[PDB]
């Protein structure tokens, strides 16, 4: 039940919403404010972690949770609790109108 705050674990051996291999097997708790509370994602706990910080797990049997700010180069605009990387504008041939901060993504603009 590693992807159910209202569901079961439905292994994402195709992109729907669940565990998928890469750690070797890797389960993600799919609902916002919910991250796994187990080294095996056996259960999904709830932790808000207001935008700008990620969730830190501090358990080896049952997980405890913290809210630590996103590192340089990552962002988080919602209460999910996992920071994502900035969109690299130069990869697609775009230009940074706004490089991005710890709560908002980068703004890419094309070449005029």
């Amino acid at each position: 039940p590693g992807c159910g705050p209202g569901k079961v674990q439905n292994g994402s051996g195709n992109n729907t919403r669940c565990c998928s291999l890469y750690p070797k097997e890797r389960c993600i708790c799919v609902t916002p404010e919910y991250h796994c509370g187990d080294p095996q994602c056996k259960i999904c706990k709830h932790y808000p972690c207001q935008p700008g910080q990620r969730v830190e797990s501090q358990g080896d049997i049952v997980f405890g949770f913290r809210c630590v700010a996103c590192a340089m180069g990552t962002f988080s605009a919602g209460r999910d609790g996992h920071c994502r990387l900035w969109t690299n504008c130069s990869q697609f041939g775009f230009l940074t109108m706004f490089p991005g901060n710890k709560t908002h993504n980068a703004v890419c603009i094309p070449e005029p």
Binding site: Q58, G59, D60, I61, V62, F63, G64, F65, R66
Partner: protein, 118 residues
Amino acid sequence: SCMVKFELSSSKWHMTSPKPHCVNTTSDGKLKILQSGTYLIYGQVIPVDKKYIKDNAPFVVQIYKKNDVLQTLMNDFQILPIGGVYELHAGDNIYLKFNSKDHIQKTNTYWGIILMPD
């Protein structure tokens, strides 16, 4: 008789005989059952005062057989007695698993096992 006690502050066992016919003791607080039969796990896990904990993690303790969770224990950082009457067999590994080693106070934290009469 056959009984052991592991003092965590000294990492030394207290045995009834230097060569027990029931278990083989290790230096890290683990046990291998040598004789099959009824056993009694015991011990008290004393956590350090909650006012000293930094990592906000649940105080969880597990007693492990070979690979099976005999029991999972947790409370609000209080004196945690462990154990119970379990039917063990030869070749079983007995060891404990802590949620975080920082939570455990070494002084007066003990555990062991004793062979069961009828």
